[PDB]
């Protein structure tokens, strides 16, 4: 990935 940050806006 690493892909999209998996934490809220």
């Amino acid at each position, epitope marked *: *990935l*690493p892909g*999209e940050e998996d*934490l809220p806006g």
Partner: antibody
Framework: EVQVVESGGGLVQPKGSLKLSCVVS????????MNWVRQAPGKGLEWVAR??????????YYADSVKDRFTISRDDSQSMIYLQMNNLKTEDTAMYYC??????????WGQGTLVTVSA | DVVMTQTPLSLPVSLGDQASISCRSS???????????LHWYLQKPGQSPNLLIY???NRFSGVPDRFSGSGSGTDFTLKISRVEAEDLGVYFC?????????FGSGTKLEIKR
């Protein structure tokens, strides 16, 4: 596989400055957050700074212990991350790791870059 | 400063036995969005930490099924079902629900004799 590599570490005098760099390879775009985490000799992990993606307005966050001595940034046209450290203290002596935060928390680490702050 | 308290700080183990490590937060790690951003890392001597478990109970790719995470709110446990020599090192719990991101002190898994 995503690869992370930090650089710029070395010997700096107290009150001095130091810029650390980081490159992420084998990654898809720049839509993830990047962090710096440090580890003083024989001590635990200390989160230092966070810079979010463009989509998250490149928002930055710092540990209170380094706030307004350290500044973090990023150049996505080269997938580079930077940590500028000012007014270094002997207590800033640590291994400094660049760490990804995409889908998985602190998933991909560099081998670290060593910063020794000493006279 | 969400304080992450790990128990014990030193854990003697016999190889082949189960091990459990406690991690407690000073406040709830449950976000408004329903997620709980609590994670576990293993650090072997002279190495960068490796992610084991993220969001309480999700095993990271490549991590053996002998590692499992559980808990809720402020109270979390990592279990290793049959400890191997490869498993020896320092375990860190991590929260990322709250900024500043914080880490537990580390629990060192060592050989009982």
């Amino acid at each position: 596989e995503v690869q992370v590599v930090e650089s710029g570490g070395g010997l700096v005098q107290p009150k001095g400055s130091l810029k650390l760099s980081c490159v992420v390879s084998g990654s898809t775009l720049n839509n993830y957050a990047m962090n710096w985490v440090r580890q003083a000799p024989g001590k635990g992990l200390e989160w230092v700074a966070r810079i979010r993606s463009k989509s998250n307005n490149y928002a930055t966050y710092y540990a209170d212990s380094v706030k307004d001595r350290f500044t973090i940034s990023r150049d996505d046209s080269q997938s580079m991350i930077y940590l500028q450290m000012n007014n270094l203290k002997t207590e800033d002596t640590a291994m400094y790791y660049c760490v990804t935060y995409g889908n998985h928390p602190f998933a991909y680490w560099g081998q670290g870059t060593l910063v020794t702050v000493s006279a | 400063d969400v304080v992450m308290t790990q128990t014990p700080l030193s854990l003697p183990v016999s190889l082949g036995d189960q091990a459990s490590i406690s991690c407690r937060s000073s406040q709830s790690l449950v976000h408004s969005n329903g997620n709980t951003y609590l994670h576990w890392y293993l650090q072997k001597p002279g190495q960068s930490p490796n992610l084991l478990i993220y969001k309480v109970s999700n095993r990271f790719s490549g991590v053996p099924d002998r590692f499992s995470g559980s808990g809720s709110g402020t109270d979390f446990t990592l279990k290793i079902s049959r400890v191997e020599a490869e498993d020896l090192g320092v375990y860190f719990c991590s929260q990322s629900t709250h900024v500043p991101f914080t880490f537990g002190s580390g629990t060192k898994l060592e050989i009982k004799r």
